[PDB]
Amino acid sequence: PRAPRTYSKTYSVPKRPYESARLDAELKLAGEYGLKNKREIYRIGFQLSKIRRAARDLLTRDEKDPKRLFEGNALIRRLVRIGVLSEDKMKLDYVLALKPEDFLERRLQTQVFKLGLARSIHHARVLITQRHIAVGKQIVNIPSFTVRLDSQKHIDFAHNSPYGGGRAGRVKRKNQGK
Amino acid sequence: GISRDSRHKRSATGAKRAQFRKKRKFELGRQPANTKIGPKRIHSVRTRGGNQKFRALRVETGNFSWGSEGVSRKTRIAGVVYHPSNNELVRTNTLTKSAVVQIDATPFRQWYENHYGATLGKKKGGAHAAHAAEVADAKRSRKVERKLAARSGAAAIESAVDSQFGSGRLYAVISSRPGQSGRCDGYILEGEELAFYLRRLTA
Amino acid sequence: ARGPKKHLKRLAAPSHWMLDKLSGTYAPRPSAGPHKLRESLPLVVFLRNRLKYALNGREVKAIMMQQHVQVDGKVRTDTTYPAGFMDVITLEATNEHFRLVYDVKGKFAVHRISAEEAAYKLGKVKKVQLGKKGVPYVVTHDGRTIRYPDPLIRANDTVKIDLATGKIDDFIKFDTGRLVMVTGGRNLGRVGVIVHREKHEGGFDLVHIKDALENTFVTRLSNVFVIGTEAGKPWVSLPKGKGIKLSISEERDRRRAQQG
RNA sequence: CCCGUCGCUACUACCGAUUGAAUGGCUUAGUGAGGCCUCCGGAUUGGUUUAGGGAACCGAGAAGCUGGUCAAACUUGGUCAUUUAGAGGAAGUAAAAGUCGUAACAAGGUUUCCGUAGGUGAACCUGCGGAAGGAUCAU
RNA sequence: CGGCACCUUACGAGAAAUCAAAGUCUUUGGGUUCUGGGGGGAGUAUGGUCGCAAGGCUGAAACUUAAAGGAAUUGACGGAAG
RNA sequence: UAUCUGGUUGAUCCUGCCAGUAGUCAUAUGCUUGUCUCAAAGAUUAAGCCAUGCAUGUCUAAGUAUAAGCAAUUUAUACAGUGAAACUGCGAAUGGCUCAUUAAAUCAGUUAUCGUUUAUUUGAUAGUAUACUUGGAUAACCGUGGUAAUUCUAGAGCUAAUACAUGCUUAAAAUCCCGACUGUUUGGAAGGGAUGUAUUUAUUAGAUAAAAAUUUGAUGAUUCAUAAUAACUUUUCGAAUCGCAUGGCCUUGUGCUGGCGAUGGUUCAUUCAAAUUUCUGCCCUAUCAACUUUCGAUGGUAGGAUAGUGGCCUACCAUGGUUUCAACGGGUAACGGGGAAUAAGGGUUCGAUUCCGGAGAGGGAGCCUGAGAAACGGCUACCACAUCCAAGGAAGGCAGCAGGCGCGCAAAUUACCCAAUCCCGACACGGGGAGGUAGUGACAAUAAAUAACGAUACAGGUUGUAAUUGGAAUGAGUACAAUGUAAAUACCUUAACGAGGAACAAUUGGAGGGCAAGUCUGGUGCCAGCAGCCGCGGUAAUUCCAGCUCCAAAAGCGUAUAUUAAAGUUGUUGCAGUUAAAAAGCUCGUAGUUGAACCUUGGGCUUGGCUGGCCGGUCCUGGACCCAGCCGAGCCUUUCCUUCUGGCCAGGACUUUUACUUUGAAAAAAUUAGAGUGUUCAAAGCAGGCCUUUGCUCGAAUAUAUUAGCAUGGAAUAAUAGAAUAGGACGUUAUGGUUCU
Ligand SMILES: [Mg+2]
Ligand SMILES: [Mg+2]
Ligand SMILES: [Mg+2]
Ligand SMILES: [Mg+2]
Ligand SMILES: [Mg+2]
Ligand SMILES: [Mg+2]
Ligand SMILES: [Mg+2]
Ligand SMILES: [Mg+2]
Ligand SMILES: [Mg+2]
Ligand SMILES: [Mg+2]
Ligand SMILES: [Mg+2]
Ligand SMILES: [Mg+2]
Ligand SMILES: [Mg+2]
Ligand SMILES: [Mg+2]
Ligand SMILES: [Mg+2]
Ligand SMILES: [Mg+2]
Ligand SMILES: [Mg+2]
Ligand SMILES: [Mg+2]
Ligand SMILES: [Mg+2]
Ligand SMILES: [Mg+2]
Ligand SMILES: [Mg+2]
Ligand SMILES: [Mg+2]
Ligand SMILES: [Mg+2]
Ligand SMILES: [Mg+2]
Ligand SMILES: [Mg+2]
Ligand SMILES: [Mg+2]
Ligand SMILES: [Mg+2]
Ligand SMILES: [Mg+2]
Ligand SMILES: [Mg+2]
Ligand SMILES: [Mg+2]
Ligand SMILES: [Mg+2]
Ligand SMILES: [Mg+2]
Ligand SMILES: [Mg+2]
Ligand SMILES: [Mg+2]
Ligand SMILES: [Mg+2]
Ligand SMILES: [Mg+2]
Ligand SMILES: [Mg+2]
Ligand SMILES: [Mg+2]
Ligand SMILES: [Mg+2]
Ligand SMILES: [Mg+2]
Ligand SMILES: [Mg+2]
Ligand SMILES: [Mg+2]
Ligand SMILES: [Mg+2]
Ligand SMILES: [Mg+2]
Ligand SMILES: [Mg+2]
Ligand SMILES: [Mg+2]
Ligand SMILES: [Mg+2]
Ligand SMILES: [Mg+2]
Ligand SMILES: [Mg+2]
Ligand SMILES: [Mg+2]
Ligand SMILES: [Mg+2]
Ligand SMILES: [Mg+2]
Ligand SMILES: [Mg+2]
Ligand SMILES: [Mg+2]
Ligand SMILES: [Mg+2]
Ligand SMILES: [Mg+2]
Ligand SMILES: [Mg+2]
Ligand SMILES: [Mg+2]
Ligand SMILES: [Mg+2]
Ligand SMILES: [Mg+2]
Ligand SMILES: [Mg+2]
Ligand SMILES: [Mg+2]
Ligand SMILES: [Mg+2]
């Protein structure tokens, strides 16, 4: 038959289900960023856990090693590109110092709210899901869309959205049309 | 049917091997030709790759070489006198490779007398004496006699081979495989190989 | 099992064809021909995946049935014809001539050549021996048999085939200092000069090759193809990159400068 | 606190006359289909083809026949392996704390325990030799 | 020098009782043999093997169970002492 | 995240297990289920049994057309277009399925064929000592039929070939053999035979250390390639073929010549393969310690057979072969591997299943055809099942696709299509349940709705809510349409419709502890029940049954079983053995394991590179000098480091054996790790990007594999050998002697 298509899990659950310190930290972190559930926090921790694992393996290698220089610079470049890592912290030792709030800062939902396009973080998610927000000239309705540094300046209302110069929506057309 | 596979044997340690697969056609064997002496009967075999083998079931003649003289002639095969593998092949006159046979000596005698001018067997009987003079009195030109005279000195052959011509039958060993090629060919015994088989025959 | 295979699964195809996993279950099984299955490039892959002249396998057959495609100066209508190293592909309708030479990345480059160079090819001598009636002949790497060769030609030499008469123009003896391309192994596509040939009776002879950047590598003699009489003098045009292997960091630096 | 017979209930496994039963593998022996090779055979069917009516003599060739070879399968026997019946016998565990006593834990009222051998409703008792894990690190 | 032991201390070890080895063991590696893997069923059944026998050696499983056990502390009790 | 927590006691510290906890490309099941992408799926039990339908056929100008087929009159009265049926050719040996057997077997990596066969493809390759073109069959067809019945076929009458069977056409010489005659010092010769290529023998070439008294290829290696001689052969094949063009020369005769192709043909090479084959490596078991050898077990000689090697088989002959370094036997709920799950490291468990290899087609066995099959959508027979029958006979093989029964805890449509991927065929055109598309599908995986924002009113510390008041927003769904597609469906786009209880209503488990969240209310009263474990329940139950409230995860959540971590409770890393389980009663002892120290060290000189700087030489970056440091060298120190010829590369002659480690090559793709790349993000995929292109242009990296084998550097560590009755080493040109080429 046809070759199998690869797939993988993008999160991992905690080993201890009930822990007040972790439960309170997660809920506090979900409330700040308007997350739907704990899996959206597990996903960030999971992908951050493997960034650290890659950095740890390179840090065990000797300096000036060809693999450490090549993959280390590439890993740093990718994190700098999405704005998670600062431009003055390109050392692969600051990669280990990253925290989950650094990644949640770069979500589209967080950036819409912090750019003033929404009243609250929860207003940001519904604006995104309802096809009002466009990055560049492309409508993005994924709240977890990680905004790149070069995409930061091009976040705005979609040109065909009621809030961005489009026609009036379904509700208004029914009201002013009666 | 007949199979040449090594799976049915037990291993070098003596362990019986389990049945791995059904018999394959690329490991088959067939049955021996058991070539006899009689009017020629040859059957072809379609072998692997579409090739052809010839079962000589019966043959009368064969191509035999006189190694010392460098001459080959087609001659009748009289019978099998010795077989190093099985004595039952001698009893039943079965022609296989390396079988010691008696062949008609006339084609080689005719070549010898025409080539050298002398005679063979050296028997003293009346017919032998008459034939010896007949060859020596054959009508030849001056050049032919000189050509024969040049070949003289090399015309003296081994005693054990010359002696056989009196009986009109030479000892030979089959070199071809009659069941594989349909030919029953060989060479005339000479030297110490002939001496070896002479002891076997007289015993 | 009971006979020759006639299919080729997509995952089992040679990796240098650069076929995608999900386009289907099967891959073009190269026909029997001058080049081995693993070291060939079927014309269907070349005309559809490389040149993108044909959009699918139905169209490449339409192209070849109009007598457009020539391999080594002869019209081929077999869509899975196994074109290989040093073969010349001519499409006179587009007025294009290609030669199949490995690039340094291990794949068959799309290497366009002039019409004058498309009039010949190189072949590595595999064996020299006597045919029937005592006529010597040479077997090249692409299965060609040339009778009455120059008596100085031996194995591992390279001959220049006229490719229109099939005769030998001239040859290059295998010796130290000759220009070489590697046609097998992980050093496939690299170009350098022979530094030292290390013999191993009963085994595989090894050849030490020095790159133009003074990088030295070792490869089996069976993977060595003499392509020039000395350094910087190849008998065919080399593909872009000149068979010089760059490290991944060097390639990344080169790509950054090329794009700004 | 606690031990063991004995009595009731349930469950598990064991032994057990029945030359028990059933299923599967391997195999001796006997019989042996069929193909293949071989041996003749020669329905009919062409003339090397010759013949003043045609007698030949050349080839092809079906059924069938002879002897081999590979050998399915069956019958009998043996053996191995896996399930399973069984009068009766002897255990273990669980349940409840039913009967008899009080063996152990205090010097447990005869210190206890080990090996061995007898005896005895039951725990157990006794002999011989050990141990202290003793109730003595000592006169 | 070799032994049989003993006294003190605990650098050290140990759950502790205690230990000059039961130390040099998470700062984990001198060499090597044997044995154990919760309590019962059970050193039982079965097979083998040794034995005259008694028995020895080798040796399960089904099933059952939340503890059984080690060392020490306080108390209570003793047909133990003061 | 290299983690632990509850349970033995009146309390304590332990051993130790039980229980809790998390994952599973790990199965089942319960409850629940809105959207997008992706997608496993009758393996487990029964390689059990199967109704029905389909799954393998195939024609170009170029094998054979008098279809009494169609079509048109056309360059055509031999045929000529198209074209059923048949003959011929090829394929049907691929694919697809399944995992029963199978434990040095398969398989993996690594070898070999100087030990063989090979349709086809691709190159070469054939002047060989009636011909203006040979025969007689047969199909389709026509018309006589027989049987209940089949993809049954029989008489009779035709007729063809690239079918079948035969058969000529040719270079120039030259060489060899026999040899009447002749010359007559050994020459000349008329006339006869033989020459290509295959087959089968026998005998010869197939050389190759450098001066004095004519050739000869390859290999590490051959009796190799190849050639020659003498013969041999139920005599191999060296075109009686087919389409398009029709040209050139005149000696204008159906004159002689000739262009591009089809198909075929011998041998060699090549390719696709096949068959054997070297080395090393498999789970449990000793309640398996000896096994193999009648009747092949190990070896030798000869043969037979084979495509070929080989006890593969036969005859004769030896008595061997394996084994505590585990042979042999037994078990496997065992196809092997790439890989999968979990994992700090080391490991443990799994792998029927997308790729590779093997095996099988109900169980055995035997074969035909063919290059290739011991083939089963081929045949023959037996066994077991099983179908039709007019009772005489005939026909079977779903572990292919779909589907049915059965089995079970356990698994989908008797759907559409060759459009893609590819395969097959005489082939641009036909066929393909291979494959693709849709259906079913909570196997797993990705993204991701179930609301957002104001005003009042209050509470509250300039703003977070708690309520009753508004106007906005949107997709779930529905739909014109377009897109998508072979045609559709769906997705993506998008008119009109589509939200206040936004009833367009989120569930699954829990609330004593472990373990997050009640000492609320009602019911029962050691009952009913809960409770993985500890425990709760006998009239105010924080634990049962309910209501309220709350907690956890959420389109998912629980349960059962297996497995992994937790488990340093299998311990090599890394356990324990006085008393918790556990040092044999004590010695000896073979295999195994393990074994004291010691042999070139130090010194000196020159030099290359890279780190820091100083220099600074700064548009972070580059040079000698200087300092140190770190690696590599090369000579000299009494000096290992092979040795000669051409002259560090190429051509010879010698060499103690390992282990170890470095480097290199190899270890298929997929998978893993990982570089690049806005699939709208992501899982993925291997794409893509450029001012918008009658085109330009980065890519599709790279690591890891690891035992075995291969090449290589190093000589510590650990083995091994050497000169003790000297049978020892050097004499390069030491002195003779014996030989051999
Ligand atoms: Mg077995
Ligand atoms: Mg052949
Ligand atoms: Mg194979
Ligand atoms: Mg093809
Ligand atoms: Mg070799
Ligand atoms: Mg009976
Ligand atoms: Mg029998
Ligand atoms: Mg058994
Ligand atoms: Mg008492
Ligand atoms: Mg008393
Ligand atoms: Mg007492
Ligand atoms: Mg008593
Ligand atoms: Mg301590
Ligand atoms: Mg003490
Ligand atoms: Mg002591
Ligand atoms: Mg136990
Ligand atoms: Mg106690
Ligand atoms: Mg206790
Ligand atoms: Mg208590
Ligand atoms: Mg557990
Ligand atoms: Mg679980
Ligand atoms: Mg089914
Ligand atoms: Mg399946
Ligand atoms: Mg017609
Ligand atoms: Mg073909
Ligand atoms: Mg297959
Ligand atoms: Mg075994
Ligand atoms: Mg050819
Ligand atoms: Mg007829
Ligand atoms: Mg023919
Ligand atoms: Mg032999
Ligand atoms: Mg032999
Ligand atoms: Mg024998
Ligand atoms: Mg397995
Ligand atoms: Mg199995
Ligand atoms: Mg498998
Ligand atoms: Mg199975
Ligand atoms: Mg497979
Ligand atoms: Mg079946
Ligand atoms: Mg069958
Ligand atoms: Mg079969
Ligand atoms: Mg079938
Ligand atoms: Mg089949
Ligand atoms: Mg069917
Ligand atoms: Mg899902
Ligand atoms: Mg809802
Ligand atoms: Mg609820
Ligand atoms: Mg409940
Ligand atoms: Mg409740
Ligand atoms: Mg709590
Ligand atoms: Mg529960
Ligand atoms: Mg308790
Ligand atoms: Mg109450
Ligand atoms: Mg109550
Ligand atoms: Mg475990
Ligand atoms: Mg332990
Ligand atoms: Mg005790
Ligand atoms: Mg104990
Ligand atoms: Mg002791
Ligand atoms: Mg030592
Ligand atoms: Mg020189
Ligand atoms: Mg790989
Ligand atoms: Mg290795």
Swiss-Prot record, chain A:
Domain S4 RNA-binding: 106-177
Location in or out of the cell: Cytoplasm
Keyword Repeat on entry: no
One Gene Ontology CC term in the entry: cytosolic small ribosomal subunit
UniProt superkingdom: Eukaryota
One annotated GO molecular function: structural constituent of ribosome
GO BP of this protein: ribosomal small subunit biogenesis; translation
UniProt keyword RNA-binding, yes or no: yes
Residue segments, region Disordered: 159-178
Function according to Swiss-Prot or TrEMBL: Component of the ribosome, a large ribonucleoprotein complex responsible for the synthesis of proteins in the cell. The small ribosomal subunit (SSU) binds messenger RNAs (mRNAs) and translates the encoded message by selecting cognate aminoacyl-transfer RNA (tRNA) molecules. The large subunit (LSU) contains the ribosomal catalytic site termed the peptidyl transferase center (PTC), which catalyzes the formation of peptide bonds, thereby polymerizing the amino acids delivered by tRNAs into a polypeptide chain.
Assembly behavior: Component of the small ribosomal subunit. Mature ribosomes consist of a small (40S) and a large (60S) subunit. The 40S subunit contains about 32 different proteins and 1 molecule of RNA (18S). The 60S subunit contains 45 different proteins and 3 molecules of RNA (25S, 5.8S and 5S).
PANTHER family xref list: 30S 40S RIBOSOMAL PROTEIN (PTHR11831), 40S RIBOSOMAL PROTEIN S9 (PTHR11831:SF5)
Family as reported in the entry's similarity comment: Belongs to the universal ribosomal protein uS4 family.
Record protein name field: Small ribosomal subunit protein uS4
UniProt organism field: Candida albicans (strain SC5314 / ATCC MYA-2876)
Name of encoding gene: RPS9B
Curated annotation (Swiss-Prot), chain B:
Residue runs in coiled coils: none
PROSITE patterns to which the protein is assigned, alphabetical: RIBOSOMAL_S8E
Molecular-function GO terms, alphabetical: structural constituent of ribosome
The protein's name in its UniProt record: Small ribosomal subunit protein eS8
Residue numbers spanned by region Disordered: 1-36
Family statement: Belongs to the eukaryotic ribosomal protein eS8 family.
Function: Component of the ribosome, a large ribonucleoprotein complex responsible for the synthesis of proteins in the cell. The small ribosomal subunit (SSU) binds messenger RNAs (mRNAs) and translates the encoded message by selecting cognate aminoacyl-transfer RNA (tRNA) molecules. The large subunit (LSU) contains the ribosomal catalytic site termed the peptidyl transferase center (PTC), which catalyzes the formation of peptide bonds, thereby polymerizing the amino acids delivered by tRNAs into a polypeptide chain.
Cellular component aspect of the GO annotation: cell surface; cytosolic small ribosomal subunit
Location in or out of the cell: Cytoplasm
NCBIfam families reported in the protein's UniProt record: eS8
UniProtKB/Swiss-Prot annotation, chain C:
GO CC aspect terms: cytosolic small ribosomal subunit
Keyword RNA-binding: yes
Domain of life: Eukaryota
Keywords, alphabetical: Cytoplasm, Ribonucleoprotein, Ribosomal protein, RNA-binding, rRNA-binding
Signal sequence coordinates: none
Transmembrane regions listed in the UniProt entry: none
Domain S4 RNA-binding: 41-104
InterPro entries found in the cross-reference section: KOW, Rib_uL2_dom2, Ribosomal_eS4, Ribosomal_eS4_C, Ribosomal_eS4_central_region, Ribosomal_eS4_central_sf, Ribosomal_eS4_KOW, Ribosomal_eS4_N
Keyword Ribonucleoprotein set for record: yes
Cellular compartment(s): Cytoplasm
Domain KOW: 177-210
Stored Pfam families: 40S_S4_C, KOW, Ribosomal_S4e, RS4NT, S4
Biological process (GO), any one: translation
PROSITE patterns: RIBOSOMAL_S4E, S4
One GO MF term: structural constituent of ribosome
Family: Belongs to the eukaryotic ribosomal protein eS4 family.
Subunit comment: Component of the small ribosomal subunit. Mature ribosomes consist of a small (40S) and a large (60S) subunit. The 40S subunit contains about 32 different proteins and 1 molecule of RNA (18S). The 60S subunit contains 45 different proteins and 3 molecules of RNA (25S, 5.8S and 5S).
PANTHER family: 30S/40S RIBOSOMAL PROTEIN S4, SMALL RIBOSOMAL SUBUNIT PROTEIN ES4
Function: Component of the ribosome, a large ribonucleoprotein complex responsible for the synthesis of proteins in the cell. The small ribosomal subunit (SSU) binds messenger RNAs (mRNAs) and translates the encoded message by selecting cognate aminoacyl-transfer RNA (tRNA) molecules. The large subunit (LSU) contains the ribosomal catalytic site termed the peptidyl transferase center (PTC), which catalyzes the formation of peptide bonds, thereby polymerizing the amino acids delivered by tRNAs into a polypeptide chain.
Name used for this protein in its record: Small ribosomal subunit protein eS4
Protein's organism: Candida albicans (strain SC5314 / ATCC MYA-2876)
